[PDB]
Curated annotation (Swiss-Prot), chains A, B:
The gene is CTBP2. Ubiquitous. Highest levels in heart, skeletal muscle, and pancreas. This is C-terminal-binding protein 2. The chain holds residues 33 to 362 of 445 of the full protein. NAD(+) binds at residues 74, 154-159, 178, 211-217, 238-240, 264, 289-292. One of its GO terms (molecular function) is protein-containing complex binding. Corepressor targeting diverse transcription regulators. Functions in brown adipose tissue (BAT) differentiation. GO terms for biological process: negative regulation of cell population proliferation; negative regulation of DNA-templated transcription; negative regulation of transcription by RNA polymerase II; positive regulation of retinoic acid receptor signaling pathway; positive regulation of transcription by RNA polymerase II; regulation of transcription by RNA polymerase II; viral genome replication; white fat cell differentiation. It is found in: Nucleus; Synapse. Belongs to the D-isomer specific 2-hydroxyacid dehydrogenase family. It comes from Homo sapiens. Can form homodimers or heterodimers of CTBP1 and CTBP2. Interacts with HIPK2 and ZNF217. Interacts with PRDM16; represses white adipose tissue (WAT)-specific genes expression. Interacts with PNN, NRIP1 and WIZ. Interacts with MCRIP1.
Amino acid sequence: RPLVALLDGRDCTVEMPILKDLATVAFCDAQSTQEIHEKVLNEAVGAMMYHTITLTREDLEKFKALRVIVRIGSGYDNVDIKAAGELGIAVCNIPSAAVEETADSTICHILNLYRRNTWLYQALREGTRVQSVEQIREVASGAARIRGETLGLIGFGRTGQAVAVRAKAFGFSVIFYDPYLQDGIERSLGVQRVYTLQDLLYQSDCVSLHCNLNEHNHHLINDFTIKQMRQGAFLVNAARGGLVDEKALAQALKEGRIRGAALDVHESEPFSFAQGPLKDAPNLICTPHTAWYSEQASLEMREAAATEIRRAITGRIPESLRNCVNKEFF
Amino acid sequence: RPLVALLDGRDCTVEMPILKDLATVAFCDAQSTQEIHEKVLNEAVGAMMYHTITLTREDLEKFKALRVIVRIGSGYDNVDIKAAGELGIAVCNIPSAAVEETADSTICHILNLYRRNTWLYQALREGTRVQSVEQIREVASGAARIRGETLGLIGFGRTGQAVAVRAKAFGFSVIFYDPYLQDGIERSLGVQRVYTLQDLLYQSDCVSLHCNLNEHNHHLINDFTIKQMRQGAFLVNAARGGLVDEKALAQALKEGRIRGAALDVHESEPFSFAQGPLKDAPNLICTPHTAWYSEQASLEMREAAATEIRRAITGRIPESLRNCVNKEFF
Ligand SMILES: NC(=O)c1ccc[n+]([C@@H]2O[C@H](COP(=O)([O-])OP(=O)(O)OC[C@H]3O[C@@H](n4cnc5c(N)ncnc54)[C@H](O)[C@@H]3O)[C@@H](O)[C@H]2O)c1
Ligand SMILES: NC(=O)c1ccc[n+]([C@@H]2O[C@H](COP(=O)([O-])OP(=O)(O)OC[C@H]3O[C@@H](n4cnc5c(N)ncnc54)[C@H](O)[C@@H]3O)[C@@H](O)[C@H]2O)c1
Ligand SMILES: CSCCC(=O)C(=O)O
Ligand SMILES: CSCCC(=O)C(=O)O
């Protein structure tokens, strides 16, 4: 019975029945490879993992039997997939759960910056009394009219498209930058496309990240590129925390160069307001990587992942696999 | 130069230049009829006011010269428009300056409930550490998939229609109840219409109020009608606080019959968490009547109000008036 290990989780209740008849399923609840038991490293043919552990070339080399890794989720930056491919290990993801969950939460972040619902709630919990209209204008200062603003999406894949489709009804003018996309999608969805990041930042009142983290876009948002943004623009990131240099963002918020930011993801997770470069940054929203979460989505993505493993077992790797992201294999 | 009085405001600066050449413009910063100076009562031909003061029949009777009242805002429940009309006073409002602002704020309240953006930010401020995937699901518990949910709007006017239009893209199934509306709109906007409040409540996972407060719908949402709502429904109210019996809502929240509520308006404003019937009610979000507000909207509506006064002075009352809401006039 081939061994399949859930690396950075304990729960295995959705996966059990789907593989029960073909494989031994075990969990390591490891936050690091160091916490992975020797039995697993040596005899595990398949692995399933979330975003909370990282597998480098060195880490991957420790696996003596591993043939397939399945990310429960869409992101796979936390796995060195070229090394994986070179060692004869196939890597897969789940591309289609939490698309709409992430789109909805992202839109929520955007509307939260523009209308200030979260901050106004906070003001009331703090005991602020709002009697006169002048006091209302005062407390809600910065609440902005959305129709006419330009929302610039970096990455126009599944989540970006999902966000655009929702953004239109609020009166956003939607534009995107995605240098790997094929020509035409802009036309299908009736949105405008720009072909440099700079053009995107120059024209945008709100910039929202929806690209996957890769070798070439680490700190995409850095001190230099922030300076390319409109004075008092909004930044939203529900993609990957490595996309943003938080020190730079920290200063921009303080200086008012960015009117506000909403972050679901961070350079170092788990996030804490007492720790890190955003410690004392003003006008900041943070959520602890929950943009994806719903009951159905969590169930759905787990079931799909188990199903990918099942294909990996019964068939040829990587041909039988539905969502393998590393054909720089063998 | 005939006197135009700003009852419950201090700032008078947008309106002055628009009227300087035709009227003396003054402000009272009055919260009640009792603080209004005798000069104004005796000599004001026109009045402009917000929502923070109320004019009863007795109050309107104290005005010896008044010919027009212009509500700076859409709501005019706070003026006895029939009494005004009987005394030969025209009442107008500004019905279209904050429609989209309010729709945007409403949708923001709804998403905050469905995705828990505000509560998750709060959880983080409270120092919750969310490291493991299992822990993420725990903090985001209740976060829901929106596609398939039924959103029921009570009142399908300007804000209601604007809200409908935005809700579609999220996958909400939109249903509405509006017993004063003509037939056909349900078809134009491609949504379902129900013909009793009970049916709307039976079918809605999320109920949102967008009706004007009038003689017949005080405490529309009460102990009785809440029992017509689905177990674990959501309530959002950005219309008027008088629509909801807060005592009733408080118990429903405590008992879980209602999973959560987001309120921009209240029976008694200004709202405080330390005071009133919702004192310690769980799963509550509140904002201090800010749904309408943006710089662009505030300016727009002040200017429109001033222009309405100008028409009242230079033309025929009520014929020259654009948005007179009480042609049960003299
Ligand atoms: N916060 C969350 O919980 C959450 C949930 C889902 C996804 N995500 C993140 O969102 C990312 C995107 O998800 P998706 O399903 O939309 O992925 P996707 O692969 O369908 O789309 C990503 C798009 O970004 C583009 N892109 C890559 N690099 C870019 C760059 N430097 N500039 C501009 N565009 C670039 C790609 O061409 C691609 O079209 C995932 O990688 C994941 O890490 C986060
Ligand atoms: N929070 C804010 O700052 C803010 C901003 C704008 C409006 N409001 C409130 O929201 C209300 C709606 O604004 P609007 O301009 O969209 O109004 P509107 O006149 O365009 O539409 C309101 C609709 O509600 C309907 N209605 C009245 N009584 C009803 C009942 N018992 N059941 C169902 N429907 C009923 C009417 O038929 C009307 O079509 C205003 O009256 C105002 O009091 C609040
Ligand atoms: C690893 S759980 C899913 C969250 C996410 O960001 C993703 O799907 O990539
Ligand atoms: C009186 S300022 C705006 C508040 C409001 O609810 C309205 O538009 O009537």
